[PDB]
Amino acid sequence: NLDIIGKRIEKIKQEHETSWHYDQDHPYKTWAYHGSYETKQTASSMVNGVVRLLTKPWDIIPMVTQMAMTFKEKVDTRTQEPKEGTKKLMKITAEWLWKELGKKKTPRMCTREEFTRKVRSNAALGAIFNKWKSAREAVEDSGFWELVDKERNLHLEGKCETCVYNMMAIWYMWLGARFLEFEALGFLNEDHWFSRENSLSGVEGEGLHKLGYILRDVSKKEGGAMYADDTAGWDTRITLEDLKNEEMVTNHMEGEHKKLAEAIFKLTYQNKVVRVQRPTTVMDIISRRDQRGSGQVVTYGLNTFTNMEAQLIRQMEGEGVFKSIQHLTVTEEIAVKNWLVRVGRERLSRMAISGDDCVVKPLDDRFASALTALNDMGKVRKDIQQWEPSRGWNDWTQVPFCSHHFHELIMKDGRVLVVPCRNQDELIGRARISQGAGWSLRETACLGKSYAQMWSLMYFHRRDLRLAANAICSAVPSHWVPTSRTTATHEWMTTEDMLTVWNRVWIQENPWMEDKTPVESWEEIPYLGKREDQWCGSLIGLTSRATWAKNIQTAINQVRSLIGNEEYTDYMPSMKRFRR
Ligand SMILES: CCS(=O)(=O)NCc1ccc2c(c1)OCO2
Ligand SMILES: [Zn+2]
Numbered sequence: 349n350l351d352i353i354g355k356r357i358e359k360i361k362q363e364h365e366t367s368w369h370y371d372q373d374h375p376y377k378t379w380a381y382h383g384s385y386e387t388k389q390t391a392s393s394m395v396n397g398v399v400r401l402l403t404k405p406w407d408i409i410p411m412v413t414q415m416a417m418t419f420k421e422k423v424d425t426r427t428q429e430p431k432e433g434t435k436k437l438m439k440i441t442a443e444w445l446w447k448e449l450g451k452k453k454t455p456r457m458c459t460r461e462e463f464t465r466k467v468r469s470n471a472a473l474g475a476i477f478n479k480w481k482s483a484r485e486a487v488e489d490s491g492f493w494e495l496v497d498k499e500r501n502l503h504l505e506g507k508c509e510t511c512v513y514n515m516m517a518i519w520y521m522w523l524g525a526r527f528l529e530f531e532a533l534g535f536l537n538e539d540h541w542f543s544r545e546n547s548l549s550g551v552e553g554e555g556l557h558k559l560g561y562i563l564r565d566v567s568k569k570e571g572g573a574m575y576a577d578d579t580a581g582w583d584t585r586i587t588l589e590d591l592k593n594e595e596m597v598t599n600h601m602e603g604e605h606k607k608l609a610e611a612i613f614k615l616t617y618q619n620k621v622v623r624v625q626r627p628t629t630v631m632d633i634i635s636r637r638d639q640r641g642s643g644q645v646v647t648y649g650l651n652t653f654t655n656m657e658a659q660l661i662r663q664m665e666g667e668g669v670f671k672s673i674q675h676l677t678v679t680e681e682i683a684v685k686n687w688l689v690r691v692g693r694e695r696l697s698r699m700a701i702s703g704d705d706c707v708v709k710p711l712d713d714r715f716a717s718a719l720t721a722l723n724d725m726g727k728v729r730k731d732i733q734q735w736e737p738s739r740g741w742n743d744w745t746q747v748p749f750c751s752h753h754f755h756e757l758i759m760k761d762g763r764v765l766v767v768p769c770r771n772q773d774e775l776i777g778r779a780r781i782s783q784g785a786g787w788s789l790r791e792t793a794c795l796g797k798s799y800a801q802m803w804s805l806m807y808f809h810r811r812d813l814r815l816a817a818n819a820i821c822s823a824v825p826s827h828w829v830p831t832s833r834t835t836a837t838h839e840w841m842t843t844e845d846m847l848t849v850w851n852r853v854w855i856q857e858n859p860w861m862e863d864k865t866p867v868e869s870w871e872e873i874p875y876l877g878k879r880e881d882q883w884c885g886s887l888i889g890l891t892s893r894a895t896w897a898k899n900i901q902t903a904i905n906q907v908r909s910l911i912g913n914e915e916y917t918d919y920m921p922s923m924k925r926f927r928r
C-alpha cells in the first residue's frame with residue numbers, strides 16, 4: 349500500500365496544500381480514496397462539412413445523424429480472486445506463452461530517438477498539456493529529459509514520484525511517465541511480438557484487407573463452430589494474478605532493462621494513483637492494485653497476451669486436459685505442460701486475437717459449455733447468462749471480428765477477394781465526424797480525403813461508398829495530402845493513384861492471390877450482389893440515392909466553390925455510369 353504510492357500522493361498534496369480535504373461523501377467503494385482538491389474544467393464530436401455536403405441522402409437517416417450528437421459504475425467494481433487450480437493453469441500457460449513469443453525475438457529498450465520520432469509524426473501516446481505546450485516542444489527541451497532522468501533513477505531505486513494516471517475510460521499520463529513505459533515495454537509493439545508470424549493467434553500489423561483471409565484460413569481447420577464471445581468490460585476484469593503473469597516477460601530481460609521493466613509493472617501497473625473529475629468540481633486522488641490502466645499500445649499487447657492465455661485454457665477445459673479449477677493434481681500439471689508442448693502451437697493457430705477481441709475454432713463443440721475457467725478468471729461473456737453455452741458460427745463469413753464481417757467476392761476474371769464489411773450507416777456516420785478545434789477548411793477537406801481513400805481501398809465493393817469516395821476525391825484538390833490527428837496498416841494515407849495502391853494491396857502483395865495480373869481499370873473491380881449491398885445498409889433503389897448519384901457533379905461543384913480556385917481531377921468517369 350502507501351509505501352509504494354505515498355510519495356506520489358505526498359507530492360500532489362503539497363501542490364494543492366490550500367485545498368486538501370478528506371471528503372466524507374466520496375462515492376468510491378472498490379477504489380482506495382486519499383483526498384480531494386480544487387479544480388474547474390471539462391471535447392464534443394464536430395461535423396466534417398466536406399463529407400456531409402457529399403452524403404446528402406444520409407442527412408435524413410437517424411443512425412447516421414445521431415452519431416454526431418451528445419460506464420463509470422463498471423470501473424468501480426471488484427473481481428474475486430481465482431481458485432488455486434485456475435491460478436496454476438494461468439501461471440503454467442503464461443510461462444509457456446512468453447517462451448514461445450521469445451523464441452525468435454529479443455527484448456530490448458526503446459530509445460529517446462525512437463520516442464522523439466514517434467511524437468514528431470502524431471501518434472496518440474495519451475500525454476497531457478503544465479510547463480511546455482505540446483509533446484513536440486517537451487521532446488526538444490533538455491529540462492524535460494532531466495525530469496525523465498530523475499524519475500528513471502527513482503525507478504532503478506524501486507520508487508516512483510510523478511507516474512500518476514488522469515481518468516476521462518482513457519487514462520492519460522504526463523509525457524515523461526509515457527516515455528519510461530515506452531522505454532521498458534515498447535519493444536512488444538515496435539518489434540511485432542503479436543504479429544501472426546510470431547504469436548500464431550495475433551494479427552498485430554496485419555491490416556483490415558488481411559483479416560478476412562486469416563478467418564477463412566482458421567475456417568479450413570477440422571473442428572467445431574467458430575466462437576467469437578465478447579467479454580463484458582475486459583479492462584475492468586484484469587486481475588492482480590493477470591498483472592503478475594504479464595510481468596513474467598521480465599524473466600526474459602537482463603541488466604538495466606530488467607530493472608526498468610520490473611518498476612513499470614510494480615509501481616505503475618500493479619499499484620496505480622489516479623486523479624478524477626467529480627462535479628460535486630474537485631479532483632479525487634484514488635488508488636487500486638488491479639484492472640488495466642496502461643498506455644493504449646502496451647494495453648493492446650498485454651490484452652492480446654492474456655486473451656491468448658485465457659482462450660488456450662478454455663480450449664484445455666473443452667478437451668478435458670483438467671477436471672476441476674478447484675485444484676490441479678501433480679499429474680494434471682504435467683498433462684497441461686505436455687498438452688502445451690505437444691499441441692499448444694496448433695491450438696494458437698486456431699485463433700485470431702486482437703486485444704480483447706477473439707475468434708476461436710476449437711477441436712470440437714465441447715468448448716461451447718467449457719465455462720468454469722473463463723468465469724473464474726473473471727472473463728465473463730457479454731449478453732448471455734453466466735452458465736448458458738456459447739452460440740457459435742457455422743460460416744466464417746458471418747463471424748464478427750474487429751467491428752467487421754467478411755465477404756467472399758469473385759472477380760469477373762475468376763480470382764477471389766476476401767473483403768472487409770460493416771453496416772454502411774456506421775461507415776458514413778464516422779466519416780462525417782471530426783475531433784478537436786481549429787480545423788481550417790483545407791485540413792477538414794484533407795480528413796474527408798483520408799476517409800474517401802480508405803473507402804476506395806477497403807469498401808470499394810459497396811456501391812454508395814465507391815461513388816461517395818470518387819465524389820470526395822473529385823471535390824478536394826488533387827495534390828492535397830490526406831491527414832488525420834489520431835493515427836493496423838494505413839495504405840490509403842498517400843497521394844499515389846488509388847488504382848495503383850489497390851493493385852499493390854489486393855494483387856501484388858496479397859499472399860492468397862496466385863495470379864498477379866494487374867487490374868487496368870476500376871470497372872474490373874467487382875461489387876457485392878445488389879441484394880447483399882442492401883442487406884449491409886446500401887441506399888441503392890431509393891429515390892433520394894438515385895437523385896444524389898444523377899446530380900453528383902452539382903454536389904462536387906458546391907464543395908469546389910467553397911474551397912475556391914484550386915487544381916481538381918474528375919474521378920467520376922472511373923465508374924461506368926459517368927463514362928458517357
Ligand atoms: C454501379 C454503380 S451504381 O451503384 O450507381 N448503379 C447500380 C444500381 C443502381 C440503381 C439500382 C441498383 C443498382 O439496384 C437497384 O437500383
Ligand atoms: Zn514513476
Ligand SMILES: [Zn+2]
Nearest residue numbers: 753769770884
Ligand atoms: Zn457486409
